[PDB]
Amino acid sequence: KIGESLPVRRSFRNWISERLLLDDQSIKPFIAEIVCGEGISNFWKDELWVAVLLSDNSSIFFNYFKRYLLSSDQNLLKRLTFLLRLACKDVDYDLLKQLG
């Protein structure tokens, strides 16, 4: 229903990031249903993991999904490094200022 265009994806990522801040415990079953689910198109799983990796809560999910991360031939754990290197970075304006 919500569609697949890019402004919607940004708004979904914001919405998840807010639910993880305001402690609505109904979200954790939903997140588990996606992460263990089938038929969900993979770019939604990627947007969800970017929201997790940008949140302060992040270490909790590694505790919760330990055996899933390890046993799946580390396939998901490899995707996480790709997403981390692409999305989770920012411009280093201090260093630009020191270079003039």
Place this chain on the structure above:
Amino acid sequence: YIKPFLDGFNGSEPISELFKKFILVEDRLNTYAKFWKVWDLFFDKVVTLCKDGDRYWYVDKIIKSYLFAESPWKENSNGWHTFKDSNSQFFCDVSRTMG
């Protein structure tokens, strides 16, 4: 330790008695991670066994033992000291696979 029972696994009655004794000793000792390691190693064998149908030999009794249904629990428990939020994935896999 458990390798002779993993290699020889079948539908015979002492497989049920084994699971009941592990549950009893864990209730005495409260050794969380070690219990869940033992339970994680038997999962695929039990899953393979139910696909023959639970009417054979003692298969239904083995299923009931593995899923905590044969032990004499107290009448008004709030929970069990070996169950935590993380372990809900066990019942998810079970209901996905042995339904």
